[PDB]
A paper describes a structure:
However, anti-apoptotic [name]-2 proteins antagonize the activity of pro-apoptotic proteins by canonically binding to and sequestering the BH3 domain of pro-apoptotic proteins through a large hydrophobic pocket (called the BH3-binding pocket). The structures show that two loops of [name]-DBD penetrate directly into the BH3-binding pocket of [name]-2.
However, we noted that a [name]-2 construct ([name]-2#3), featuring a shortened α1-α2 loop and certain surface residues replaced with a [name]-xL sequence, could be expressed in high yield and was suitable for crystallization. To improve the success of crystallization and to ensure that the linker does not affect protein interactions, we linked this [name]-2#3 construct to [name]-DBD via three different glycine-rich linkers. In particular, crystals of the three [name]-2#3-linker-[name]-DBD fusion proteins were successfully optimized for X-ray diffraction, and determined at resolutions of 2.3–2.7 Å in the P 21 21 21 space group. The RMSDs for superposition of these three structures are 0.2–0.5 Å. [name]-DBD and [name]-2#3 had similar interaction modes in these three structures, indicating that the linkers did not affect the complex structure. Notably, the flexible loop and modified residues of [name]-2 are not located on the contact surface with [name]-DBD. Two loops of [name], the loop linking strands S5 and S6 (S5-S6 loop) and the large loop L2, insert into the BH3-binding pocket of [name]-2#3 which is composed of BH1-3 domains.
Numbering used by the authors:
A (entry chain A): 95 to 288
B (entry chain B): 7 to 32, 90 to 202
Amino acid sequence: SSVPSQKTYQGSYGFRLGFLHSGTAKSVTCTYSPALNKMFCQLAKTCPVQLWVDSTPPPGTRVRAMAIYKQSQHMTEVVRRCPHHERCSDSDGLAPPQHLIRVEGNLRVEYLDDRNTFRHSVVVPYEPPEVGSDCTTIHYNYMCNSSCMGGMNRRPILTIITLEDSSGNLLGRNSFEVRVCACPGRDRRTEEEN
Amino acid sequence: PSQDNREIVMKYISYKLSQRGYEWDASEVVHQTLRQAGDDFSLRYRRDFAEMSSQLHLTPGTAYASFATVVEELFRDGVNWGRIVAFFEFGGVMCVESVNREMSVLVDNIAAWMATYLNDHLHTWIQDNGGWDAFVELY
Ligand SMILES: [Zn+2]
């Protein structure tokens, strides 16, 4: 019955989110606005979200992703894909067709159709940054447009990234708005001044 | 019944080994969509396959249990078509690497290993999830 919380929780490991320095172009498939805490992207294309951490979590930690609607009147409704894209044949073999968020390039990905919250989530095991770098990058996929009628119907959503342990207890939480669009650059600068 | 399943494995390995220069001797509607799915997975999950290939230290003395241990972790949270494709691809990946390390005899072992794990663990689920027909209907 309750709605997932969006409250920031850096926790005992200093869990913070990061995104690449991408600008408003036309050949831009993914760009994040620091001013609006909003990421703009197209359907089924790479969305790199890096996990910044001040102290490496222990082994067995998991990184979860969940979408909720931003407006208060729609927070109680599950974020699902539209019927067109659920019946559409774009499954990679690992993601169930109803899920909106996916993770590409990770064989250990798992998708949860929660039998009590009815809410979809994607979880991968946490791994410390690669040698030479300083953050863990996860590539997400949004398989439905924000404009997509019958699903979101132009309702803006948030993506909640949480750190959790073996049993799913909270270790960290961060969030950011996301819009799925055909032309992100034009749709970003349009909202970057209003 | 199982035999048909041994054909799926050896046909897969003889096809991927053949796109290299290695010739290896031990309808087609399902084998080609499986081989096409595997060629996809070798690019998507090259880091995972390299990690699985490092946990399995493939030597001539490598036993089936060391192979099933890595593959069982692949199906830890349940089996699906995506992870079955990665099962076929990881197997075909290992033979390609063993041929490249002057260990051509290890291919027959990997072929046999994939067959037994297929019949003992994946076959029961394949039959109740629409068979290989359903894998053609989607992928
Ligand atoms: Zn849609």
